[model samples]
Target: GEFLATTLERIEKNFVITDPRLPDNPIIFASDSFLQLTEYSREEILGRNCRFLQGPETDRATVRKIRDAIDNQTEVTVQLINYTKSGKKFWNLFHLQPMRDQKGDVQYFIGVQLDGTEHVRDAAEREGVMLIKKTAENIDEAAKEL
Candidate 1:
């Protein structure tokens, strides 16, 4: 129930609980929304390393951050490029926090993945529009010189 509660809090904030444990090992838990986003069924993802979601576009720095956090038993937040199980690329903002047992040993790590593809796309589109406007202005100036 504690796991569900923690995961639900993350989901309620529009984050997806992609991996509940270190990516170096089998994933212990994955949320339904995560399965939907990755286009994978529960059976396919369970017991699989979360790194399976990585690809060429995946951010090495972000992965390093995650690894480092786990190694040091700290919390970290980073933005990364991740691939869906079907190979669709998306931007993700990951927040990784270590959960310790009563004995103070790090038992599990909770990763919250927030979808940021839309924001990234919107920013790219805005830059494109600005470039277009600049090009149009340059052309108008050139026409005036004729």
Candidate 2:
């Protein structure tokens, strides 16, 4: 519970902890954010896994990469879709680093999450416009042949 106190203070102030798992379990640390983001409060997220954030739009491959990197005790970056408190989906960029102890064993994992939904949506829109333009061009060429 002591670790939770520190975690709560940092999160409330919008400051991320260096090692969320330090002095506490990783599951509990993530549960805090999950609760805030899902508007479910701490009680609802206490025993659930973070994967609850994932949905049909979420990239499964990116999640796998994150899991592999953690298992291998290495640093990794991944971009994926995540659902918010209101079930609104958004793009998230996650950077994670494994912290090792003096004995060269992984003691904790440090993760930083950035919300990139706006950028991703802009890019997708641009791509959609390009596809429409290309399709129009193709139709024009076909009509000219007729």
Candidate 3:
């Protein structure tokens, strides 16, 4: 049956909560998939800003965009460069939205992340190797100016 395909796609794509009003806006909860993605254990992630995954290569522009949205109490999707526990760099499709309580007060932010590295790697395999290399260099140049 097609159950395998459907079930696999019906993943529990969820979010982690952050609220500064209480114990400060840190990761309140993280899913197991998240644990797997960043190679971070629950013990290490909770009570810390998710920026722990950032490093010298994390794109500042993308970070600014997310900050703007969060600052404005708005929602947005952003792509960020993230590093794993072993310092492995990868792209992450990140999104965030504010969660409100029964009184319509913004309680916390729900942050989500999707691994984008696999998608790029697959596309890279099907394209001109030389062109992809040039494109990679251009990305670094853009980072420097941004």
Candidate 4:
């Protein structure tokens, strides 16, 4: 659908949209930024849950919080350790939010990933917040176009 197409065209951030209605809530769209960030191919990311990036060092409590938000269809932000395809770990500022269609039906959940390993806390927080905000806005606008 053009909804997905428009979303891909509009959003240039490191983000992914997962289909909650599907089994395991597989990733439906993975941004190029996300591909580069995780050093994964589109095929490796699509049809798979984002948990593939989780590592042994990733906090169980943080994973639980993310799952709780998904189960409740709510937004959540967590800073946790996530591994790249090469097994290199980095701090990720992960923001998850539901993306609804023009008809107000929750169509997908968008997860915006901000690499926090390179920046100080203050600047990274602002950047992470703004990046998710802008990505959400782009998703909303893309839905409208469809």
Tens-digit lDDT string for candidate 2 (27-124): 34443443454555554444445566689887788999978887677776556888876788876655566555557665555454555455344676
Per-residue lDDT for 88-138 in model 1, tens only?
Answer: 988766666655555776565556566656534467645544443343333
Clashing pairs in 2: none
Candidate 3 lDDT score relative to the true structure: 0.62
Put down candidate 3 lDDT per residue, 1-146, tens digits, no spaces.
Answer: 21121221223442455775755479766655666778877677778887887889888998989888877887776667888898988777666766655586666777766666643444543343334334323322322211
Give the top-scoring candidate (lDDT): 4
Q: In angstroms, how far off is 122's CA in candidate 2? A: 13
Off by over 4 Å in 2: 1-4, 7-26, 30-38, 119-146
TM-score comparison, 3 vs 4, better candidate: 4
Q: Estimate each model's TM-score.
A: 0.65, 0.59, 0.69, 0.84
Which candidate gets the maximum TM-score versus the true structure?
Answer: 4
Q: All candidates' lDDT scores? A: 0.58, 0.52, 0.62, 0.80
lDDT of 2 at 47: 43
lDDT of 2 at 86: 74
lDDT of candidate model 2 versus the reference? 0.52
How should the candidates be ordered by lDDT, best one leading? 4, 3, 1, 2
Evaluation by TM-score, superior candidate among 2 and 3: 3
Which ranges of candidate 3 are over 4 A from the true structure?
1-11, 22-24, 118-146
TM-score of candidate 4 relative to the true fold: 0.84
